[PDB]
Amino acid sequence: MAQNLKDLAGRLPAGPRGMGTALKLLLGAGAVAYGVRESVFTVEGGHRAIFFNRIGGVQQDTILAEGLHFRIPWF
Amino acid sequence: CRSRPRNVPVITGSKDLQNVNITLRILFRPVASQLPRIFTSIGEDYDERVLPSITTEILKSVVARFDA
């Protein structure tokens, strides 16, 4: 299966310089959009989805009444 | 916020304590101004899961104070 991906990636036409940087920028934008989408969490109302601070445990003082609160991914 | 129907039978004891069976109407129109709360801390099935029990409680208490 790895060799098939090898051939598929290789077969991409050797286009002029512009589209290479274009593809790099597109990948950057895709990753950034994915991160922005993921920074919000499963949220039902009737659930004060509080900030679980990574350090020190739960945020005993950060009591999330009804309101945006972006979870730092992996944090 | 309609006054949806909620008929809630009750089987209590009167003051002279003959077994009294009373049903009641909960003509509940959730307060429009309080619906934020009526979904935060009351929820979607507000009536089905709030009103029947309070009806039973109140009706039994009232019946306890009058003979058959």
DSSP letter for each residue of B1-68: ---B--EEEEEEE-SS--EEEEEEE--B---GGGHHHHHHSS-TTTTTTTHHHHHHHHHHHHHTTS--
The alpha carbons of chain A give a radius of gyration, in whole angstroms, of: 21
- Look up residue A63 and give its amino acid: I
Resolution (A): 21.0
Chain-centroid distance of CA A74 in Å reads: 10
Which residues, 6 or more positions from A43, have their beta carbon under 8 angstroms from its beta carbon?
Answer: A49
The token pair at A18 is 């512009």
Alpha carbon distance A61, A5 (integer Å): 51
**Residue listed under structure tokens 């009804």:** A66
Which residues, 6 or more positions from A15, have their beta carbon under 8 angstroms from its beta carbon?
Answer: none
Q: Which residues of A touch B40 (CB under 8 A)?
A: 45-46, 66
B41 in Cβ contact with A45 (< 8 Å) = no
A49 in Cβ contact with A62 (< 8 Å) = no
Alpha carbon distance A70, A64 (integer Å): 11
Q: Is B45 in CB contact (< 8 Å) with chain A?
A: no
Q: b/e per residue, A19-48, with b = 16+ CB within 10 A?
A: eeeeeeeeeeeeeeeeeeeeeeeeeeeeee
Q: Which contiguous run of DSSP H or E holds residue A20?
A: helix A17-38
With CA atoms as reference, the chain B residue closest to A47 would be: B40
Alpha carbon distance A50, A21 (integer Å): 41
With CA atoms as reference, the chain B residue closest to A48 would be: B40
Q: Tell whether the torsion through CA atoms of A39, A45, A51 and A54 is positive or negative.
A: negative
